[PDB]
């Protein structure tokens, strides 16, 4: 069951005509919040993470390759740049651009049919947000290269907490505003009203899943007995709290959001039913032997 | 490896020297399993003669417990205090092997102790030698053990362990079969729902095509 | 409901009773589910009767 | 649970200043040994009564409760103290994490036994594994 | 201002002593606080309120 | 996806158990030399199967099961509400105008 | 267990009839069985359904309705005195003994559930038996008694398939 292109690998197709039609029509010119979804390949995340950690506490960055399907940015590769940078400020003077177009020209022959879809930057341990000059960077990147998104990575937070600190951001055009609050400015920038985040999800290939499932498990009291359904109790409480506001906004709209709210609630209920199933299978495995 | 050293020194010893070595072994701290010493040929050969009481003592300390000794005090020779201590520790191990929550009354009756303080001191002394990892409870009078070292095994309980392992394997197989059946049912249900959706979509597209006449 | 207390009028003692969150939430959730099921049962029948257009003459 | 009837050797080799009392009815060595004994009892116990605690720490009675109260509110040992029943709670487990730790122990025992048996007779284990995987 | 004083010190003592316990006798508080049981109740009710 | 990871783990755990049982059987049959050290650890492992059969653990497990069941109820109802709203919206234009 | 099928067959025989009236034994058995199952509303409606002629012909139905009214008023000594006041036929004999011991068991359960301290005389009236043997008996089952004051203090007495069905239903 590998020769056929399943629903998992169907995203690995680069249709030149469809992308050309999308880039010619330009539906994003009218709707400012046109893009919402950001799908990212696994290996891009891997290369990004290893490049961020290889530089240590020095900021590193690169250009990513991908396409756009409707309102979803599908990124299929990451790439490193030969730049010199400090903890907070970088230049990318000439070496990056001497290894940017040359890399594209080289990749045109190996089989890489993708083009520039955005850039990722590593912020070492000071949040996932668009800086005061990075917002202008995405300003002039989007003003002429409309299919585009800025990716921000925190290496220190990911390496310490254990969760991927990834953020996909796009900015509003100058003039589109819709005194600063004290809760949306610490997790964002001082120009938080000038940019918004996009939902981020990842995809992989069928052979990737097959290799992962046979790589190494052990994980008997590491996964099969790990206080499941309980470790993310704070996550579930936060989710069940914000579904209240989601449903109340949906009801106000009724007096569409409701499908999104139902999907959001279904995700949590399915996750915790999976936790219950794991607990039940553990009970049937260990407790009920040798009565 | 105190037991290995003792059995090495006991290779050629026989007679009263053998009994003296046995008495030394039975009082040495840190030795709590008398496995390899008993299987030695000379120890079994001491069955004949007037020294069989020592062999019975070794058999009692290998598989038996304190009540067996106190019930057969008349024939077995007297022993030093450390040897009573080792027997009491082994009895605690045997009691914890069966049930993992030892009531205080059962332990007190079996070990023939007077007050709670002496029993608690004895049990903490047993714990201090890393034999078992347990918690003492005073409110409910229930010792809670977690890990206990296995004692000697005769050539009769192998059937029991084989039976238990076979039962565990059968349980694992049944669980795997149930998992397979459940995942198959889920897959077929999803497929059936998808086919139903496809059929209704085909019908609506057909009627839409027909309407434009 | 201003004072959450009970009166034991034999020894004349005013006891304070604290509510258990689990039992209250379970009971109210079950009651709401039953009411919703009854409401659905009624309204789907109403949908049928509106479909058949039944009225007095 | 080191006791006071085998600690005279340490007290013998003590400088006059290091041994001089704090004028609280007990020596500083008696302070240290009692505090260590109380901390040690806080591990291999779950909940104990004052009458029983008045044997590990010697002590008349309520002074053990005073020492236990002093131990808490200083970031040293966990657990609350009852006074109506005269029973002190050190720390209790909540069932399910104990189940996870038992899974820990059992599966590590299985893995260690497998490693030992593979290292004991490599030929037989190899034969059995290659027959099973067929 | 000695009535405002001699009061914060006793409240601080009560707060420090009440941290580890979970249920105690009022006379036990009375013994260490060096005041009658009624005043102990008054201090406790004021602190709770 | 949630089930196959459990299935593979249980499969190879059962394979380990089968290997241990096979060695015990072989030692009983005398094919391998009789070792008096592995059998004791195996006996302890055998004695350590019935983990935590106390009543407190059973009560906690049943509490967890009931909590998750009511969670599933609250979440099945919100989806049948979505289906109900969809049906009402569909019906409000075909058989009865406005 | 035979009472359930007896009720089923008697109800079927009552439902189909040349004129809606069955034999008087059928009425007696049906009413007695309704009383046995503690279903008073159906028994009363059946009694009101009986034509006047057949109910006036036999006093058996009158007596069984009298004990039915006694059950209705929940007067337990009335139950124990009415059930043994008339001589009954064979067709209704082997069901009223079951009624009597079922009501005795129900009274014992009610006393064990509701009452915490009950005078021995009232408890004996509820049971319907002399005080002495009831006192010794409740001594054996484990109810502490009290002499002098003469008081009784009774003491009060597969999954984964469903889960995968639920997850399949919710995943849509």
Swiss-Prot record, chain A:
Entry EC no(s):
3.4.-.-
Q: Which residues bind Zn(2+)?
A: 121, 123, 134
* A GO molecular-function descriptor: metallopeptidase activity
Q: Does the keyword ATP-binding apply?
A: no
Cofactor(s) needed, names only, are: a divalent metal cation
Q: Which PROSITE patterns match?
A: MPN
Gene Ontology annotations for the cellular component aspect, listed alphabetically: chromatin; COP9 signalosome; cytoplasm; cytosol; eukaryotic translation initiation factor 3 complex; nucleoplasm; nucleus; perinuclear region of cytoplasm
Q: Name one GO biological process term.
A: regulation of protein neddylation
Subcellular location, principal: cytoplasm
Q: Could you tell me what this protein is called?
A: COP9 signalosome complex subunit 5
Q: Which organism is it from?
A: Homo sapiens (Human)
- Give the lineage: Eukaryota, Metazoa, Chordata, Craniata, Vertebrata
From Swiss-Prot, chain B:
User: What are its GO cellular component terms?
Assistant: COP9 signalosome; cytoplasm; cytosol; nucleoplasm; nucleus
Domain PCI spans what residues?
A: 1-150
| Coiled-coil annotated residue ranges, if any | 179-213
Say yes or no: keyword Cytoplasm present. yes
Q: What is its main location?
A: cytoplasm
Give the UniProt record's GO annotations in the biological process aspect.
COP9 signalosome assembly; protein deneddylation; regulation of protein neddylation
Q: Which domain of life is it from?
A: Eukaryota
Give its localization.
Cytoplasm; Nucleus
Keywords on record:
Acetylation, Coiled coil, Cytoplasm, Host-virus interaction, Nucleus, Phosphoprotein, Signalosome
Q: What role is this protein assigned? A: Component of the COP9 signalosome complex (CSN), a complex involved in various cellular and developmental processes. The CSN complex is an essential regulator of the ubiquitin (Ubl) conjugation pathway by mediating the deneddylation of the cullin subunits of SCF-type E3 ligase complexes, leading to decrease the Ubl ligase activity of SCF-type complexes such as SCF, CSA or DDB2. The complex is also involved in phosphorylation of p53/TP53, JUN, I-kappa-B-alpha/NFKBIA, ITPK1 and IRF8/ICSBP, possibly via its association with CK2 and PKD kinases.
Family indicated by similarity: Belongs to the CSN7/EIF3M family. CSN7 subfamily.
Q: What quaternary structure, including any partners, is listed in this protein's UniProt entry?
A: Component of the CSN complex, composed of COPS1/GPS1, COPS2, COPS3, COPS4, COPS5, COPS6, COPS7 (COPS7A or COPS7B), COPS8 and COPS9 isoform 1. In the complex, it probably interacts directly with COPS1, COPS2, COPS4, COPS5, COPS6 and COPS8. Interacts with EIF3S6.
Name of protein: COP9 signalosome complex subunit 7b
Q: Which organism is it from?
A: Homo sapiens (Human)
The full protein's residues present here are 10 to 222 of 264
UniProtKB/Swiss-Prot annotation, chain E:
> Which Cys-Cys disulfides exist here?
none
Q: Where in the cell is it found?
A: Cytoplasm; Nucleus
Q: What post-translational modification does the entry describe?
A: Phosphorylated by CK2 and PKD kinases.
Q: Which domain of life is it from?
A: Eukaryota
What the protein does comes down to: Essential component of the COP9 signalosome complex (CSN), a complex involved in various cellular and developmental processes. The CSN complex is an essential regulator of the ubiquitin (Ubl) conjugation pathway by mediating the deneddylation of the cullin subunits of SCF-type E3 ligase complexes, leading to decrease the Ubl ligase activity of SCF-type complexes such as SCF, CSA or DDB2. The complex is also involved in phosphorylation of p53/TP53, c-jun/JUN, IkappaBalpha/NFKBIA, ITPK1 and IRF8/ICSBP, possibly via its association with CK2 and PKD kinases.
- Which family does the record claim for this protein? Belongs to the CSN2 family.
Q: How does it assemble?
A: Component of the CSN complex, composed of COPS1/GPS1, COPS2, COPS3, COPS4, COPS5, COPS6, COPS7 (COPS7A or COPS7B), COPS8 and COPS9 isoform 1. In the complex, it probably interacts directly with COPS1, COPS4, COPS5, COPS6 and COPS7 (COPS7A or COPS7B). Specifically interacts with the ligand binding domain of the thyroid receptor (TR). Does not require the presence of thyroid hormone for its interaction. Interacts with CUL1 and CUL2. Interacts with IRF8/ICSBP1 and with nuclear receptors NR2F1 and NR0B1. Interacts with NIF3L1.
Protein name in the entry:
COP9 signalosome complex subunit 2
Curated annotation (Swiss-Prot), chain G:
Compartmental location: Cytoplasm; Nucleus
Tell me a GO biological process for this protein. Answer: protein neddylation
InterPro entries noted in UniProt: COP9_CSN8, CSN8_PSD8_EIF3K, PCI_dom
Q: Which UniProt keywords apply?
A: Cytoplasm, Nucleus, Phosphoprotein, Signalosome
What do the Gene Ontology cellular component annotations say?
COP9 signalosome; cytoplasm; cytosol; extracellular exosome; nucleoplasm; nucleus; perinuclear region of cytoplasm
Domain PCI as annotated: residue spans? 1-157
Domain of life of the native organism: Eukaryota
Which cysteine-cysteine pairs are annotated as disulfide bonds in the entry? Answer: none
PROSITE patterns noted in UniProt: PCI
- Which PANTHER family does this one have? COP9 SIGNALOSOME COMPLEX SUBUNIT 8
Q: What the protein does?
A: Component of the COP9 signalosome complex (CSN), a complex involved in various cellular and developmental processes. The CSN complex is an essential regulator of the ubiquitin (Ubl) conjugation pathway by mediating the deneddylation of the cullin subunits of SCF-type E3 ligase complexes, leading to decrease the Ubl ligase activity of SCF-type complexes such as SCF, CSA or DDB2. The complex is also involved in phosphorylation of p53/TP53, c-jun/JUN, IkappaBalpha/NFKBIA, ITPK1 and IRF8/ICSBP, possibly via its association with CK2 and PKD kinases.
Q: How does it assemble?
A: Component of the CSN complex, composed of COPS1/GPS1, COPS2, COPS3, COPS4, COPS5, COPS6, COPS7 (COPS7A or COPS7B), COPS8 and COPS9 isoform 1. In the complex, it probably interacts directly with COPS3, COPS4 and COPS7 (COPS7A or COPS7B).
* UniProt family annotation: Belongs to the CSN8 family.
User: Which protein are we looking at?
Assistant: COP9 signalosome complex subunit 8
